[PDB]
Structure 1
Amino acid sequence: PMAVEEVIEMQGLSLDPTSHRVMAGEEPLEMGPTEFKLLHFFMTHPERVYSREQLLNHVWGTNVYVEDRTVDVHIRRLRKALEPGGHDRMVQTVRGTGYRFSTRF
């Protein structure tokens, strides 16, 4: 995608950095700012697995302080927001290791 604020798309799921609009095809999806940031990170760092520690650093930063399970909490809310189109299946748990976003499922 040779464009910075360009719309990211994967398996029918699109995310607009400018308007913060996320869609399963043409149906709009609802999620908070943390989930959006998490989804944005996943769609741009696909297939690879990340520990909660890595996801905390990439998404929450450092000037805040959050526990690892908080990641699990927002992973849940994100999956929940992605259900309409079944895209929640793209947010996958890597047993006792972390999470990955995949087109394969």
Structure 2
Amino acid sequence: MAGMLTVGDLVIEESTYTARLKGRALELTYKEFELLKYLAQHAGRVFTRAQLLQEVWGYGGTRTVDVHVRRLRAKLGPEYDSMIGTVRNVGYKFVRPS
């Protein structure tokens, strides 16, 4: 274990650069990974688009986060759709399972 993370059945191993949902590997884009990992690296806390952009993207079209969130939730599936929660007029946040 070098930089590996675990929330629920989601595991994000930055070492091998894989994300996996109880055996089923998630084939994500680069930013879907740098986004899903950041949100899970700070579970429970809601971030805003400007925050998420300045960190995951780096130092307009802010809706690219919404697109990346949708693509993430669609790849997660219904069983894990909930893992990325929306806060109206604020932003998004990883939510912890039971």
TM-score, structure 2 normalization: 0.90
Partners of 1:35 and 1:58 in 2: CA distance:
13
- What do the CA deviations read for 1:1-22 (whole angstroms, capped 9, x no partner)? xx6x331011100011011111
Amino acid at match of 1:46: A
Amino acid at match of 1:83: G
- What do the CA deviations read for 1:16-38 (whole angstroms, capped 9, x no partner)? 10111111111111210100000
Percent of aligned pairs with the same amino acid: 38
Residue from 65, 69, 74 that aligns with 1:80? 74
Partners of 1:39 and 1:80 in 2: CA distance:
13
Instruction: Give the 3 Å change call, closer, same or farther, for CA 11–104 of structure 1 in structure 2.
Output: closer
Instruction: Give the match's secondary structure for 1:46.
Output: coil
8 A contact 1:10–1:103 mirrored in 2: yes
Corresponding position of 2:95: 102
- The count of aligned residue pairs is 98
Instruction: Give the match's secondary structure for 2:96.
Output: coil
The gaps in structure 2 that reach 5 residues or longer are none
Residue from 83, 86, 91 that aligns with 1:93? 86
Partners of 2:18 and 2:8 in 1: CA distance:
16
